[PDB]
């Protein structure tokens, strides 16, 4: 092994000397405590090491040992219910080993080495196996966790363990030439896990929010970004997605965020239920927690560990949702490391390779045919926290250029307590066209036309607001003022969604379809009544407006009857009231 000594210490940065032969981005043990660090520069006989832990108390002369391997994660059974740090250390074990505080230098296996798993082989001796093929199955929480061949392992099966209880260290399958395959393998977090081919985004990723699932949909394999100032509701939207998504597995990455939010997830989620499995929601969730007061160099590691775990679960045929709770924190960590490196910044202090790193991270998403032949997907939703809410900041601009959906939050709606507080004008989605056949087959044949009509009404309202802010709403004609009123009705009782209300927190596609149909039926009838001389102030007093407003609070089970009753009420009210 490559061994050296510490030459300089400055914050998270340690320069070692005598490290000739050490490779770039290899993991090193720094100091007598063996703190984990990564080599980010080689210069003569020296190596620049960014330590993933606190460096306070280190002295010049302490040994630095290179392990000769880059950062890697253990991929196997045992991750589906746990919370990890940036470099994949279980926080439950760390708590049991240290207490209420996280102390540096703790060494603990990512996967519990004593937990027993019910192994069921799927292969027989003489079978030839390629990377990503299913060796067998193990149940975890009702999930059928598939033991995969490592992506770059090839050979013929020589011996296979029979069905029984084994630990992840047990070599369940031994190939010819003596290569042993355990229940887990290690993968470098910076390498994208190989696949066969990327597939077109056919099916949607149902987030459970009306505005996101209707006006700005994201596909099952797509990417989305949700930037906004502090208090706009990024994390509440992320947690709503984690609670209500239709993804099989949710990987939540709290990169440089509040620890109280990780605690909220840890406490609330075991009580909630998985909509599809029926079991606890925490059983389908993997948490990678790197709080803001944890070491800065570990934020990049946190992002990469999360995305690698998401890729691994995709390789088993699952639909994975990856919520990165902030990428601006990762960018700030990169800027801090670059400042320690004394490198010339690109723009606003960030290193030039920030855009390349972001693009590499976001390109890992997609619906794919896995190496084993089965079909899985990864959906990445990345939150961005621009400094001061300045959307012209380089991270937000770099994210604009690689994401298919953009959910822009504005502090104006958050101040009003109008939530989800999505800026409709500043948001967009590039998946609306490709998802239309699925909408026609699964929601309604006329759903795309209804959605387009709603968007056109919002556009007309936006155009008329230019005049409303000029001469007041009373200076408009009855048709234009009707458009304004229908726009505010849409905004208040279709786009609003209370993430804490027991009914309004979730909304199926058919409920949103019914609400849109009700609103547009009311709009058509109101315009017809306007053309026959009825006043708009007379229209605004109809109790069917109250029914439309209360529609969103109606439960999913009883919604169809409410919708039929309200459509009948719309027709009757605008027949009687002319």
């Amino acid at each position: 092994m490559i061994q050296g000594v510490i030459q300089k210490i400055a914050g998270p940065a340690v320069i070692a000397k005598g490290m000739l032969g050490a490779r770039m981005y290899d993991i090193c043990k720094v100091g007598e405590e063996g703190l984990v660090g990564e080599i980010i520069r080689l210069d003569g006989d020296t190596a620049f090491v960014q330590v993933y832990e606190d460096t306070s108390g280190l002295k010049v002369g302490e040994p630095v040992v290179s392990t000769g391997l880059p950062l890697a994660v253990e991929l196997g059974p045992g991750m589906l219910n746990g919370i990890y740090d940036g470099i994949q250390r279980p926080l439950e074990r760390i708590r049991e080993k240290t207490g209420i505080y996280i102390t540096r230098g703790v060494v603990v296996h990512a996967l519990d080495r004593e937990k027993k798993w019910a192994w069921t082989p799927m292969v027989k001796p003489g079978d030839e196996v390629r990377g990503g093929m299913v060796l067998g199955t193990v149940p975890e929480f009702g999930f059928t966790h598939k033991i995969l061949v490592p992506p770059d392992v090839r050979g013929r099966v020589k011996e296979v363990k029979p069905a029984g209880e084994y630990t992840v260290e047990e070599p369940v399958v031994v190939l010819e030439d003596g290569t042993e395959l355990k229940m887990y393998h290690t993968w470098p977090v910076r390498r994208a896990r190989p696949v066969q081919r990327k597939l077109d985004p056919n099916t949607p990723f149902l987030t459970g929010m009306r505005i996101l699932d209707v006006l700005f949909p994201v596909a099952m394999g797509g990417t989305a970004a949700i930037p906004g100032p502090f208090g706009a509701g990024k994390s509440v939207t992320q947690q709503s997605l984690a609670k209500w998504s239709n993804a099989d597995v949710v990987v939540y990455v709290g990169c440089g965020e509040r620890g109280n939010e990780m605690t909220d997830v840890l406490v609330e989620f075991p009580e909630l239920t998985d909509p599809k499995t029926g079991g606890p929601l925490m059983h389908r969730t993997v948490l990678i927690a790197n709080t803001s007061n944890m070491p800065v160099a570990a934020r990049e590691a946190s992002i990469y560990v999360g995305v690698t775990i998401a890729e691994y679960f995709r390789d088993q045929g699952f639909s994975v949702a990856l919520m990165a709770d902030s990428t601006s924190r990762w960018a700030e960590a990169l800027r801090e490391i670059s400042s320690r490196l004394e490198e010339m910044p690109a723009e606003e202090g960030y290193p030039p390779y920030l855009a390349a790193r972001l693009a590499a991270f976001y390109e890992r998403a997609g619906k794919v045919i896995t190496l084993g032949g089965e079909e899985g997907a990864v959906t990445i939703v990345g939150a961005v926290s621009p400094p001061g809410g300045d959307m012209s900041e380089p991270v937000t601009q770099s994210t604009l250029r690689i994401v298919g959906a953009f959910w822009r939050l504005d502090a104006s709606l958050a101040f009003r307590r109008h939530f989800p507080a999505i800026n409709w004008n500043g948001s967009y989605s590039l998946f609306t066209s490709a998802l239309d056949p699925w909408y026609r087959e699964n929601v309604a044949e006329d759903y795309p036309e209804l959605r387009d009509a709603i968007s056109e009404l919002l556009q007309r309202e936006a155009g008329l607001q230019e005049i409303v802010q000029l001469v007041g709403p009373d200076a408009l004609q009855d048709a234009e003022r009707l458009v304004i009123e229908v726009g505010r009705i849409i905004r208040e009782d279709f786009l609003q969604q209370n993430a804490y209300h027991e009914v309004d927190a979730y909304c199926s596609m058919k409920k949103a379809y019914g609400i849109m149909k009700m609103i547009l039926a009311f709009y058509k009838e109101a315009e017809a009544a306007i053309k026959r001389g009825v006043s708009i102030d007379e229209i605004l007093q109809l109790p069917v407006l109250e029914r439309i407003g209360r529609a969103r609070y109606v439960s999913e089970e009883e919604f169809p009857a409410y919708f039929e009753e309200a459509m009948k009420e719309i027709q009757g009210a605008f027949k009687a009231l002319a």
Partner: protein, 41 residues
């Protein structure tokens, strides 16, 4: 309109001043990179 124009030009001047300061800092750090590389060899 004149007030909005004055605000626009004020914001433009402030942004340009911040950019000028950033360029000055970049020049300083490039000079220090070159110097600290030159004497150390």
């Amino acid at each position: 309109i004149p007030g909005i124009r004055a605000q626009i030009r004020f914001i433009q001047q402030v942004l340009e001043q911040r950019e000028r300061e950033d360029t000055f800092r970049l020049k300083r750090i490039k000079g220090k990179i070159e110097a600290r590389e030159a004497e150390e060899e």
